[PDB]
Design a protein around this ligand. Sequence first.
Ligand SMILES: C[C@H]1C(=O)N(C)C=Cc2cc(OCCCCCOc3ccc4c(c3)C=CN(C)C(=O)[C@@H]4C)ccc21
Length: 127
Amino acid sequence: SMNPPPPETSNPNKPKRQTNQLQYLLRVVLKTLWKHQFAWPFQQPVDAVKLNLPDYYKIIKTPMDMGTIKKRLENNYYWNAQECIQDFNTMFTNCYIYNKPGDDIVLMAEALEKLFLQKINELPTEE
Ligand SMILES: C[C@H]1C(=O)N(C)C=Cc2cc(OCCCCCOc3ccc4c(c3)C=CN(C)C(=O)[C@@H]4C)ccc21
């Protein structure tokens, strides 16, 4: 019934590094998706209490959102760009699992996902 704590976005024990790929993920990928018209339901953790979804955290065991993804990227929480890419996939996949095809929320996740897959095709080469 209650919401779980938000996903961890900061750990001082984790090593930090900056890469051209992680910078692209926040400056290009995150910035493009955030401003999109369908982004609003994905900009923060699913609030199962305020949205009245009592079974959400019974179906979804790996919650994810762009707010958490952006906080992780600002805190230097990701070491590999693939960790961030998996997080975006998990957010899209959670939406498709909890909801049904043809739903307005699924059509919004599908458009964000198409915008995301185009950006990852142009992900610069490691340095
Ligand atoms: C599980 C959870 C979920 O998976 N996530 C990610 C988060 C939240 C969420 C949000 C959900 O619902 C949001 C509402 C549906 C999206 C907006 O779609 C429409 C459709 C029609 C209109 C408008 C918007 C706009 C203006 N008005 C007033 C209109 O009448 C027009 C015609 C459902 C599920 C989740």
